[PDB]
Motif scaffolding. Structure first.
Motif, PDB file in Angstrom:
ATOM      1  N   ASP A 247       0.832  -1.207   0.000  1.00  0.00           N
ATOM      2  CA  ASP A 247       0.000   0.000   0.000  1.00  0.00           C
ATOM      3  C   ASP A 247       0.866   1.257   0.000  1.00  0.00           C
ATOM      4  OD1 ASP A 247      -1.477  -2.234   1.815  1.00  0.00           O
ATOM      5  OD2 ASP A 247      -2.930  -1.140   0.616  1.00  0.00           O
ATOM      6  N   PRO A 248       1.448   1.619  -1.161  1.00  0.00           N
ATOM      7  CA  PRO A 248       2.459   2.675  -1.131  1.00  0.00           C
ATOM      8  C   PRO A 248       1.909   4.099  -1.037  1.00  0.00           C
ATOM      9  CG  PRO A 248       2.519   1.473  -3.219  1.00  0.00           C
ATOM     10  CD  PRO A 248       1.550   0.774  -2.364  1.00  0.00           C
ATOM     11  N   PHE A 249       0.698   4.334  -1.551  1.00  0.00           N
ATOM     12  CA  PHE A 249       0.217   5.702  -1.816  1.00  0.00           C
ATOM     13  C   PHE A 249      -0.833   6.141  -0.808  1.00  0.00           C
ATOM     14  CE2 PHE A 249       2.823   5.648  -5.350  1.00  0.00           C
ATOM     15  CZ  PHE A 249       2.621   4.471  -6.040  1.00  0.00           C
ATOM     16  N   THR A 250      -0.800   7.430  -0.497  1.00  0.00           N
ATOM     17  CA  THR A 250      -1.717   7.988   0.463  1.00  0.00           C
ATOM     18  C   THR A 250      -3.099   8.075  -0.138  1.00  0.00           C
ATOM     19  OG1 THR A 250      -1.445  10.287  -0.185  1.00  0.00           O
ATOM     20  CG2 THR A 250       0.107   9.439   1.516  1.00  0.00           C
ATOM     21  N   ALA A 251      -4.057   8.354   0.724  1.00  0.00           N
ATOM     22  CA  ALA A 251      -5.435   8.601   0.298  1.00  0.00           C
ATOM     23  C   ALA A 251      -5.493   9.730  -0.727  1.00  0.00           C
ATOM     24  CB  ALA A 251      -6.289   8.928   1.495  1.00  0.00           C
TER      25      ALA A 251
END
Ligand SMILES: NC(=O)c1ccc[n+]([C@@H]2O[C@H](COP(=O)([O-])OP(=O)(O)OC[C@H]3O[C@@H](n4cnc5c(N)ncnc54)[C@H](OP(=O)(O)O)[C@@H]3O)[C@@H](O)[C@H]2O)c1
Ligand SMILES: NC(=O)c1ccc[n+]([C@@H]2O[C@H](COP(=O)([O-])OP(=O)(O)OC[C@H]3O[C@@H](n4cnc5c(N)ncnc54)[C@H](OP(=O)(O)O)[C@@H]3O)[C@@H](O)[C@H]2O)c1
Ligand SMILES: NC(=O)c1ccc[n+]([C@@H]2O[C@H](COP(=O)([O-])OP(=O)(O)OC[C@H]3O[C@@H](n4cnc5c(N)ncnc54)[C@H](OP(=O)(O)O)[C@@H]3O)[C@@H](O)[C@H]2O)c1
Ligand SMILES: NC(=O)c1ccc[n+]([C@@H]2O[C@H](COP(=O)([O-])OP(=O)(O)OC[C@H]3O[C@@H](n4cnc5c(N)ncnc54)[C@H](OP(=O)(O)O)[C@@H]3O)[C@@H](O)[C@H]2O)c1
Ligand SMILES: NC(=O)c1ccc[n+]([C@@H]2O[C@H](COP(=O)([O-])OP(=O)(O)OC[C@H]3O[C@@H](n4cnc5c(N)ncnc54)[C@H](OP(=O)(O)O)[C@@H]3O)[C@@H](O)[C@H]2O)c1
Ligand SMILES: NC(=O)c1ccc[n+]([C@@H]2O[C@H](COP(=O)([O-])OP(=O)(O)OC[C@H]3O[C@@H](n4cnc5c(N)ncnc54)[C@H](OP(=O)(O)O)[C@@H]3O)[C@@H](O)[C@H]2O)c1
Lengths: 169, 169, 169, 169, 169, 169
Positions: B46-50
């Motif tokens: 889950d590399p990326f922010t919201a």
């Protein structure tokens, strides 16, 4: 790409908010619009859910010819620590360059984190504000005239007037 | 107005997700697209922010000619109680009629709450999936080919490849 | 099986609450009794813990000949999102059919979720209420006369009067 | 008055749990029964909600001739801090004197807080475990024989078997 | 004034941690020492509370002649959002200039927020580490030799060995 | 070893607080000093972050000839459940014997948990209060005279006066 950020409760989204948004879009490439106090719903001051407000903004911005490429709509719950709120916004948004706010706390929090902060380009009068919208909903005044028609349609679908009247009894 | 709902981590948003979205838009008026596990960022899975994912979806859906009037993009944090997750989604979204998911838990939670649930109209193969995208980012494969160019531009701006490589050391 | 639901702070449980409960048991098979604001204790308005109130209800309902098969006692902490509170209750309770409340917010939240909602069958006067009970505890009035004796015994065991007097200094 | 405390997930409540409870009631005046991991539902290991388990226990204890004056049933969500979990239990429960548990963490947490701790008086047979009950629900085995009939009735009403089967697809 | 920051679970604080701290104090004026995972206690990997670790550090740093003016000791609970963790640290600490960590996630989070990040000046071998300390506590090895005597005294007072042995049954 | 505990907001830490601390240190071997309402910052009543107050206390206690072996400084966020707050403090602190507080809630919570509680040994003069300090910061009065010089230096570095003035606009 110059990106602005705006944050408000928008309970509900009204013509004043939209006037301000359009003015900001004259001076930034893209505007990040945050729906603040997204946790609050079903009170006299904060009647609408996060989702209902997302719906309002999405429909209104699309009704008024603003290209989708120029904005983002993001719900932001309040948090107990003021010192973390900017970090909270940052996590939930695209990268941005400049914050538009007239609120001293919002200004100071963003300034302390190194952002450029400026007042909104326009100020709308009280009779066009959310307080007035909600009062008119309660008192059978002309609330519809204060909203984009797309927002009126949302309020009709979600029985917003019925809700606020019940909550006030 | 018939509104569908879709929910996924979209780590990152890729061509497969978009193919599925376009297929759903053939059979609903509007689609609510939820970014699940919005709290998770800065890991290999889950590399990326919201906010980064909101940016990806917003740019991609606008790049591909889908009118803004046909969709909503909403980040949804996971919660500890499965029995509350549907209520959580509902609070954060416009009203909707039908949920698209292949996931047994998501199906059952929505079904128990009285929603119509159906499988997505299309299934994409593993070599077009997020797992493959992220592996290629790590291993200097052709990750760009698996994404809309608007998403590639987001990943370049946020230094996404650099991030995931650092996190894997 | 027709199940009602009632929710109240019950700070403490008094004869008025019990009168209402018995009236509700005339028209439902079983009553789910939720202790609201279960997080609040050790204040003038909310002196008793969730556990102390569970004890009060359990003893009082048993003392008054109501069979155990006809009720459930469930502590329910408040939550920040009104839009999720009904979902929260639902997760913590057996399935139910009808909600009894005089509170406009409780009514509206449950009605929006599709439940039948009605006012309690009885309204007790202010001189029999929790406010009066707590005032009498503070001022050495006749608080015992307003409570079932089983509740008095709980209050004696937990040193409730001592607590509220200390808190008011 | 000597009060014991017991804690378990009870996914679902079975004849074993009831045997143990009856055995403890030979040694204490009253038993506080806590439903642990109350936040977990809709998985293979933890299928049932807090409310569904409250229902199971409430019905089973009332349908087996245990007087209501001798027990309390309290859902307890897990919390992130082990050092607070005893305080959490205490807030949610009547005052108690002795804890029954075979779990080393539960024992040590309570012991450190000054409570008497003892193992349960009975260890039920391998047949009566929750793992076996859940396997039989999935595989169309004789799950009903492992439960009090009052719990069977709960599982029927809430479509427990259909849930667990869907979740396992 | 040049301030460094270090963050670790320190379960427990051992001579290796102290060797590293002293090396860092050669190159900064003051060191902010954060006790990470401050929510975790009473497990085999994380036996000690936040408070117990605060006590360990406070005593050890005082025992070893480091002036109080050169350090701060701050417990920091983990949080669900990696994107907010640096903001969380910042709120809980004095202003700082440089972070010391060998952990890729800690490094990247701080670097993305604009901090200078460097590896610790020293790396200690596995036989001097917390894993080895805890194993020796469990197996009656020479755990005391791996700790400052001031930490041994804390462990004796809080019955740390007894705790970890009970938890491992 | 006799350990006392003290709790206060310390917004900011002033000469009064230091007088009281020195007075307590005549009666105990060690003092645990908790910074209460650690979550509150950036308001008129609570301007400073947890970290800024940790810094203030750390510098002031070290610059006044109190040996490091005699105190601990711990930030403590408020929590929603009064019945858990003592447990919360306990987790975050070394073991302690006696609580110093003039606050009826703090006294009663600790007393119920079995701690000895006593009023602070000294009541400082009205001049040394936080209300006065903050008013003088706002109104360009002599706030510096009310603080230890080490705290003044903290307030200068963090631009405390500029913050409070901006927030009051
Ligand atoms: N720690 C935290 O969680 C934290 C910290 C800081 C801020 N916040 C949140 O940030 C959000 C925004 O803060 P805020 O103080 O701006 O709240 P707000 O309630 O959205 O706005 C404050 C008032 O200003 C009015 N207004 C806004 N723009 C205007 C303009 N251009 N002309 C005239 N009137 C205007 C709004 O009018 P209307 O009634 O017409 O909308 C409202 O009455 C809130 O949700 C707040 O809770 C949260
Ligand atoms: N209690 C709670 O908070 C709760 C409860 C239920 C669900 N959720 C959340 O709901 C979100 C969605 O759940 P999910 O199980 O669907 O997770 P997900 O991780 O978004 O999807 C599961 C897998 O299915 C793949 N996939 C999805 N649609 C596909 C399609 N049309 N064709 C082929 N492959 C497809 C995804 O591929 P890619 O790798 O390509 O994306 C992924 O590998 C998650 O964020 C989850 O945490 C939360
Ligand atoms: N977001 C959320 O968490 C959320 C949302 C909605 C509601 N709630 C919770 O739900 C609970 C119940 O709400 P509530 O508004 O009913 O609060 P409440 O504190 O239980 O009291 C409502 C008021 O009505 C009185 N009352 C109740 N039944 C009566 C009757 N039959 N006759 C006369 N007076 C009566 C109570 O009197 P006494 O003093 O005698 O008890 C009290 O003064 C609260 O704990 C509230 O916090 C939470
Ligand atoms: N920090 C926290 O939140 C925290 C800290 C400590 C504990 N807890 C909670 O406390 C609860 C208690 O832990 P637990 O592991 O005992 O729960 P559990 O899920 O009931 O596990 C106990 C296991 O042993 C079995 N068992 C229990 N009593 C027995 C008996 N008398 N004879 C034979 N078998 C018996 C149970 O069988 P069945 O499968 O048949 O039930 C189950 O397999 C959990 O929900 C845990 O999460 C929480
Ligand atoms: N989202 C969040 O909440 C978040 C995000 C990032 C990090 N964190 C927290 O930040 C804290 C620190 O992270 P961490 O990964 O460093 O965890 P850690 O548990 O402190 O340990 C890192 C590993 O490296 C070892 N180590 C540390 N310094 C060393 C050195 N100089 N030489 C040799 N070995 C060394 C430690 O050994 P020992 O066994 O000897 O201690 C441990 O085995 C953790 O509590 C983590 O949970 C939280
Ligand atoms: N549930 C919870 O989370 C919970 C429960 C209980 C308490 N708490 C927390 O515990 C903290 C302690 O409460 P508190 O009201 O004592 O905090 P506080 O904010 O320090 O209030 C005490 C007031 O009395 C003054 N004062 C204190 N000691 C004095 C002395 N020896 N001589 C003269 N004046 C003195 C303080 O003056 P100054 O203005 O000069 O400092 C302040 O005005 C708070 O942060 C509170 O929120 C939390």
């Amino acid at each position: 790409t110059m990106r602005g950020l705006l944050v408000g409760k928008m309970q509900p989204f009204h013509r004043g908010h939209l006037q301000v948004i359009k003015s900001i879009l004259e001076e930034v490439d893209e505007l990040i619009i945050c729906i603040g106090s997204a946790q609050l719903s079903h009170s006299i001051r904060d009647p609408f859910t996060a989702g209902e407000r997302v719906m309002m903004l999405t429909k209104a911005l699309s009704e008024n010819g603003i290209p989708a490429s120029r904005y983002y709509i993001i719900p932001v719950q309040d948090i107990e620590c003021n010192a973390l709120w900017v970090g909270h916004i940052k996590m939930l948004t695209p990268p941005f360059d400049r914050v538009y706010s007239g609120n001293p706390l919002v200004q100071r929090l963003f300034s302390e984190d190194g952002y450029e902060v400026t007042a909104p380009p326009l100020f709308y009068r009280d009779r066009y504000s959310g307080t007035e919208v909600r009062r008119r909903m309660l008192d059978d005044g002309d609330w519809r005239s204060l909203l984009p028609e797309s927002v009126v349609e949302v309020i009709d679908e979600i029985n917003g007037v019925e809700r606020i009247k019940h909550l006030a009894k």
